[PDB]
Amino acid sequence: MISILHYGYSFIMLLGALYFYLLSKDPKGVPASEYLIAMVIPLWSGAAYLSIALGQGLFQYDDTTIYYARYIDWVISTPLLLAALALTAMFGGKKNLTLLFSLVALDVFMIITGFVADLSIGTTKYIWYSLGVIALIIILVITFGPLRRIALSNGTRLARHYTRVAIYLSALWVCYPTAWLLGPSGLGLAQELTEVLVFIILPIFSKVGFSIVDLHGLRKLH
Amino acid sequence: MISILHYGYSFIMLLGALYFYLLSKDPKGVPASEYLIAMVIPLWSGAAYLSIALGQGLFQDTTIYYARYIDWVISTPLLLAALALTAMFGGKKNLTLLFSLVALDVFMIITGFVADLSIGTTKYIWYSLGVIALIIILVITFGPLRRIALSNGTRLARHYTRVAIYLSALWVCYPTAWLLGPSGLGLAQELTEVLVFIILPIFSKVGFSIVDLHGLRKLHQ
Amino acid sequence: MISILHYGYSFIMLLGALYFYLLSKDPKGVPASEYLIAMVIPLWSGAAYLSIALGQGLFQYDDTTIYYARYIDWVISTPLLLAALALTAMFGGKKNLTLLFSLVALDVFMIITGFVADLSIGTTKYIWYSLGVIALIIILVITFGPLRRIALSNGTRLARHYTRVAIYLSALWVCYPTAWLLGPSGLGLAQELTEVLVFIILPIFSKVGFSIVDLHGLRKLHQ
Ligand SMILES: CCCCCCCC/C=C/CCCCCCCC(=O)O
Ligand SMILES: CCCCCCCC/C=C/CCCCCCCC(=O)O
Ligand SMILES: CCCCCCCC/C=C/CCCCCCCC(=O)O
């Protein structure tokens, strides 16, 4: 079942990528870079999840299964999602690349701490986990503070679309660390099959759903 | 023999890099970035191949030359960047198209590494994903990228077409040799594959940049 | 003792990062990018050294301890320090990103050769070490040659600050390969505890000290 679910994920990711490629042919004022980012995210995620389906993207550490291919996915897909969010705030204005790369740096660190926490035992696990949550909070502060102020400087219609996408992404993103802590990597209150289903469903809303909402809004401003 | 060949490769790479550095001192209207790219490719490839000569860049009942993937994950995207900048010479840069090629190429090299560590059908799933990536790269090279080269004039377009055909020919040889050699069907022997992955890279890591830079320098007059 | 020293390092790195964040709030004509770089260097170094304190960032290779977390640190922190130096030379003028990325490329290669030398045995160790020293010499040539000429083109006051920070960084940087060769990774003349102290103290002068000197100088040019 675990294998079949991952094949299904990969096929959905492929269809998402094709959809964004079709939209790119009639761009409606959205620069090509934002279509390219929307295509890379699901293609990369699809390839990582395919490695899990084929039994390669996981190993047995102590008496637990580490799905290490999820970290390979997120270290590329999550910074690209933050870049898409930042470019949405900056649509029709000057780019602030310093703020964009600040988000990328926080995000890569967050994903690495999660990988190290998964390989850790005892208190050390929760030190790494905690550093990642701090990174996520600073990301949320930037998202609803300075980045939202840039979106307001680009006008009411853009600011409203930005706010909608920021809330959408922020809602997903708090679920990941929560699921991690409850599942076998953390306190073990939730079963492996439950965690697998969450980390199949959530990524569909994050790696394809976010880009549908984000690009449709920007296209409607044309 | 395998060790000596790799030392020889590294020394050739060093001479190629020195040559490009000398050309950079009299640039003839070619931006410094294009000389830098031409220097990094052989120096990185040389260092990877040196690790094979010294017995470090491989592990073992099949021998995986993993240092080749370390080489290509840096050297192949830089070759596509040099090709893309050749098309765009004298005109507006399209960095979205350039980064699309880098992304496809890095993916292609990673699939090859995973295919080499894989057994049975799984090997050929990964191999196949890499071939699809390579086909999209060739479509971009002869389609949209060639259209940008045409928009920059007949002389540039002719040089672009020549270097594109040159690189496109090398590049189909790599996956073909991989499949026939010990990583794939095993029809060809280890020593044969070693010689192919010594000779081909000399044409790709030094030869391509001689052809590419000489053409661009000739457009100065 | 080795663990406690690494915890102390990490806490100092955190305080350095907070200091640079505070300076950023009143930037005095220094672009945001230079404050961001000054913050990333100690935060990254802190996290790497924390992994050593917790017993994760090292392993036993035969009869030696490899502190591999140091290379994870330097592969990010050292190119960012060269970027800060290059941006100091280019302050008030056109950026030369080709020269900046030439320094990044040399530096990443230098750190990789060090990691491979540490995993190597016998003559092979000293081949890799040597390639890294050649990279470091080319970096020093660029620093005192073309990069210093760019600093001169941006005025006497900038050029004087550039020269001061370049000498500061150049002194630190020759110490790293010297300590490496004398310690357990090389000739083994110095003991593990000695090398650990050097690779706690030097990084404090490089990962926080450099950025205090560099940013204070640039902020003084606003007045
Ligand atoms: C934790 C790993 C860190 C890796 C990422 C490093 C990020 C630091 C780089 C900073 C680049 C700054 C962006 C360039 C500024 C251009 C001007 C602007 O639009 O603000
Ligand atoms: C698949 C492995 C990892 C690859 C990651 C590559 C990232 C691709 C995203 C880059 C965005 C491109 C930005 C171009 C900006 C300028 C736009 C233009 O003028 O065309
Ligand atoms: C050893 C691994 C090396 C990896 C990094 C190599 C980088 C090579 C690429 C060169 C990019 C140069 C940027 C050119 C921008 C032109 C504008 C300018 O010069 O100011």
Cβ-based neighbour number of residue B189 at 10 Å: 11
For residue A54, give the nearest of B122, B127, B112 by alpha carbon. B122
Distance CA A183, CA A180 (A): 5
Residue among B203, B221, B220 at smallest CA distance from B79? B203
Query: CB–CB of A65/A184 below 8 Å?
Result: yes
| Sequence letter at residue C80 | L
| Element housing C64 (H / E) | strand C64-66
Chains linked to B by 3 or more Cβ pairs within 8 Å? A, C
Please list, in sequence order, all residues whose beta carbon lies within 8 angstroms of the beta carbon of residue A89, skipping any fewer than 6 positions away. A147, A148, A150, A151, A154, A158, A162
The closest alpha carbon to C42, from C10, C75, C86, C7, belongs to C10
What whole-number distance in Å separates Cα of residue B160 and Cα of residue B84? 9
* Burial class of residue C19 in the structure, from the number of CB atoms within 10 Å of its CB (0-12 exposed, 13-18 middle, 19+ buried): middle
Q: Which two tokens stand for residue C168?
A: 């500061």
DSSP A33-73: HHHHHHHHHHHHHHHHHHHHHTT-S-EEETTEEE-THHHHH
Contact C31/A98, CB-based, under 8 Å? Answer: yes
* Residue-level length of chain C: 223
Contact predicate B101/B134, CB 8 Å: no
Instruction: Say yes or no: CB of residue C33 within 6 Å of ligand 1.
Output: yes
8 Å CB contact of C116 and B56:
yes
State phi, psi for A64 to the nearest 5 degrees.
Answer: -125, 155
Type of residue numbered C222: H
Can you tell me the distance from the alpha carbon of C101 to that of A170, in angstroms, rounded to the nearest whole number? 35
Q: Would you call C101 and B54 a contact, using CB atoms and an 8 Å cutoff?
A: no
Interface touch B122/A40, C-beta < 8 Å: no
**Which positions ≥6 away from A195 have C-beta within 8 Å?**
A179, A182, A183, A184, A185
B128 CB within 8 Å of a chain A CB: no
Q: Is B88 exposed, middle or buried (0-12, 13-18, 19+ CB in 10 A)?
A: buried
Task: Give C190's DSSP letter.
Answer: S
* Contact assignment for B56 to C101 by CB distance below 8 Å: no
Tell the residue nearest (CA) to atom 2 of ligand 1: A105
Long-range contacts of A144-153 (CB under 8 A, 24+ apart): A144/A170, A146/A99, A147/A85, A147/A86, A147/A89, A147/A99, A147/A103, A148/A89, A150/A89, A150/A90, A150/A93, A150/A96, A150/A99, A151/A88, A151/A89, A153/A93
The full 3-state SS of B55-111, as one line of letters, equals: CCCCECCCCECCHHHHHHHHHHHHHHHHHHHHHCCCCCCCHHHHHHHHHHHHHHHHH
DSSP letter, residue B185: T
Q: Which two tokens stand for residue B30?
A: 């070619």
Cβ of A3 under 8 Å from any chain B Cβ?
Answer: no
- Cα–Cα distance, B52 to B68 (Å, whole number): 9
Which residue has tokens 């994760």?
C56
Measured in Å, residue B100 CA sits from the centre of ligand 3 at 17
Residue whose tokens read 């961001």: C36
Across-strand partners of C61? C64
- As a whole number of angstroms, the distance between CA A159 and CA A166 comes to 10
Considering all CA atoms of chain A, what is the largest pairwise distance in Å, rounded to the nearest integer?
55
What number of residues does chain B have?
A: 221
Residue the block writes with tokens 């999209």: B136
- Which two structure tokens, joined as six digits, stand for A84? 């898409």
Angle between helices B95-117 and B67-87 (to 10 degrees): 160
Helix (H, G, I), strand (E, B) or coil at C188: coil
Residue in C33, C43, C56 closest to A98 by CB: C33
Distances (CA, A) of A27 to A31, A34, C111: 7, 10, 43
Q: Which two tokens stand for residue A51?
A: 């490695």
Question: Helix (H, G, I), strand (E, B), or coil: what is residue A75?
Answer: helix
**DSSP, res A207:** I
Torsional sign, CA B175, B181, B182, B184: positive
Q: CA of B95 to nearest chain A CA: how many angstroms apart?
A: 9
Chain A contact for C33 (CB, 8 A cutoff): yes
- Residues belonging to chain A: 222
Query: Chains meeting C at 3+ CB pairs closer than 8 A?
Result: A, B
Residues of A numbered 50-79 whose beta carbons fall under 8 angstroms of chain B's beta carbons: which are they? 50-51, 54, 56
Beta strand A59-61 with A64-66: parallel, antiparallel or unpaired? antiparallel
Tokens of B76: 């192949």
> Helices B190-202 and B154-180, interaxial angle, to 10°?
170
Q: Looking at residue B26, what DSSP letter applies?
A: S
Cα–Cα distance measured from residue C208 to residue A67, given in angstroms and rounded to the nearest whole number = 37
Cα–Cα distance between C111 and C126 in angstroms, integer?
A: 14
Residue type, B66: Y
> Which ligand lies nearest the alpha carbon of C32?
1
Using CA atoms, how far apart are residues B70 and B110, in angstroms rounded to an integer?
10
Residue B9 neighbours by CB under 8 Å, 6+ apart: B45, B46, B49, B53, B198, B201, B202
For residue C98, what is the nearest residue in chain B, using CA coordinates?
B33
DSSP, collapsed to helix, strand or coil, labels residue C66 as strand
Q: Whose CA is nearest to atom 5 of ligand 1?
A: A105
**What experimental approach yielded this model?**
X-ray
Q: Specify burial of residue B135 (Cβ count, 10 A radius: 0-12, 13-18, 19+).
A: exposed
Find the closest chain B residue to A46 by CA distance: B129
Residues 6+ apart with CB under 8 A from A222: A28, A29, A30
Q: Please indicate if any CB of chain C lies within 8 Å of the CB of B32.
A: yes
Contact B130, B122 (CB under 8 A): no
Distance, in Å, from the CA atom of C131 to the CA atom of B220, rounded to the nearest integer, reads 36
Which residue from B96, B107, B111 is facing A36, i.e. has the nearest CB?
B96
Give the helix/strand (H/E) hosting C192.
helix C192-204
> Which DSSP state fits C65?
E
For chain B, say whether C105 makes contact (Cβ under 8 Å).
yes
CA B101 to centroid of ligand 2, rounded, Å: 9
A218/A24 Cα distance (integer angstroms): 13
Rounded to the nearest whole angstrom, what is the distance from the C-alpha of residue C84 to the centroid of ligand 1? 11
**d(CA C82, ligand 3 centre) in Å:** 14
Q: What string of DSSP letters covers C105-171?
A: HHHHHHHHHHHHHHH--THHHHHHHHHHHHHHHHHHHHHHTHHHHHHHHT-HHHHHHHHHHHHHHHH
C206 — phi, psi (to 5°)? -85, -45
Mutation test of ligand 3: which of B24, B34, B40, B72 has the most ligand atoms closer than 8 Å to its C-beta?
B40
To one decimal, the resolution in angstroms is 2.2
Residue C55 CB-density burial (10 A; 0-12 exposed, 13-18 middle, 19+ buried): exposed
- Mutation test residue for ligand 1: of A80, A94, A101, the one with most atoms within 8 Å of CB: A101
| A39 φψ region: left (φ > 0), alpha (ψ -120 to 50), beta (else) | alpha
The three-class DSSP label of residue C61 is strand
Among B96, B114, B129, select the one facing A33 at the smallest CB separation: B96
Angle at which helix B144-151 crosses helix B121-142, to 10 degrees, equals 20
